[PDB]
Structures are given as structure tokens and as C-alpha cells.
Amino acid sequence: NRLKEKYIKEVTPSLVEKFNYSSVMQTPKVDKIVINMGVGDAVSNAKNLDKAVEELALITGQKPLITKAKKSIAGFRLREGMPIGAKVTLRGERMYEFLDKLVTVSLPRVRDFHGVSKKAFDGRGNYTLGIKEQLIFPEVDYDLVDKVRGMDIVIVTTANTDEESRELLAQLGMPFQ
């Protein structure tokens, strides 16, 4: 929505004025947002998975998968096939609407207000922020949440350097500290 049009207006010519390409087909983009919510206590009860999928479906207009074990760990009490986590992806406006949600609503309503932790680099710009809380989002009922978990979110762009990922997400909000 908005940030498409910022790429139209200012971001992508600023990226040309910095990185000095030979085409706009040489330009980095943003593609995927991968979301993870495991339980582990589903050894006991998958009703945490139930209300977790309820929360995720109230976050974005999807329902996730139900990811199984793919291992066998007696220390975690795991066989094969034991369902653990849940996967949400984003495309379209649900990229950009969620981006502006992170700009506007959620992230300036997180206790111990400092900004955004920087070092999520992976070398090639793959910023994964393991979120502390569940009760941040305005779509969240206090009278349903029973644990103090948070969010695993993988954000994948085509930014080729950590500098590119920094400059893009700084031009998409994200107050690095």
C-alpha cells in the first residue's frame, strides 16, 4: 500500500543514488514473512495449539500448518510425527499492512521502550526477531491469553547486504537503537 508507493517515490531512486545500478532490474525487494508458533507442551495438551491458531488467525487472514517433529528426542519426549509448531506466511498487502502495523500499533506498545534490536543479520539480511509478548497486538483478548509467550517471525527480503536490509527496514519504520 503505502510502502509500495514509497518505493515508487523515494526509496528505489535513493537506492539507485547509493548503489548505482545499471538497471532497476538490479534492485533488491522484500518477499516473504514466515511465522512460527511452537508449543512443546502439546505432549500434554494441544489446546495451547488450538488457541494459538486462534490467535494467529486473528492476526492475519490465514490458518497455519501443524508442524510435526521430524526427530525423536527423549529429552524433549519426542517420537517422530509429534506435532509441535505452526506456520503462517504473508504476501500482497498482508506484507505491507503488517509492516505498517509494526510501524504504528504493536512495536511502540512494547514494555521497556527502546526501539529495535539490530543484530539479526545472518550476513545476507535475514532479520528474525523472537518477540517477547503475546498481548501486544490490538487483536488480542486479555481474557483468552493464558501464557506469556511471544512470536517467532522470519522476515526474508532480497536485500543482498545487511546494509541493504538495514536501509530498507529503516525506510520501512523499524527504529534501530
Partner 1 sequence: MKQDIHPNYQPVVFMDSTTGFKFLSGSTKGSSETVEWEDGNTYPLLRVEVTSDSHPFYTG
Partner 2 sequence: ITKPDKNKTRQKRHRRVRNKISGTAECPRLNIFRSNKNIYAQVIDDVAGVTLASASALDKEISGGTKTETAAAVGKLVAERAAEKGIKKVVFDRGGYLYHGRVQALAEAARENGLEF
Name the residues that contact partner 2, by CB under 8 A: 31, 156, 158
Report how far residue 40's alpha carbon sits from residue 82's, in angstroms, rounded to the nearest whole number. Answer: 9
Residue 92 C-alpha from the chain's centroid: 15
User: Among 148, 175, 149, 3, which Cα is nearest to 86's?
Assistant: 149
Residue 5 engages partner 1 in binding (rule: CB under 8 A): no
Exactly one of 43, 115, 132, 163 binds partner 1 (CB under 8 A); that residue is 115
Residue 105 engages partner 1 in binding (rule: CB under 8 A): yes
Cβ atoms 171, 7 nearer than 8 A: no
- Contact partner at residue 78 from partner 2, partner 1, RNA, none, CB < 5 to 8 Å by partner kind: RNA
* Cβ distance to RNA smaller for residue 103 or 154: 154
Residue 118 engages partner 1 in binding (rule: CB under 8 A): no
SS3 37: coil
Count of C-beta atoms within a 10 Å radius of residue 30: 20
> Site residues (CB under 8 A) for partner 1?
1-2, 57-63, 93, 97, 100-101, 103-105, 108-109, 113-115, 138-139, 175
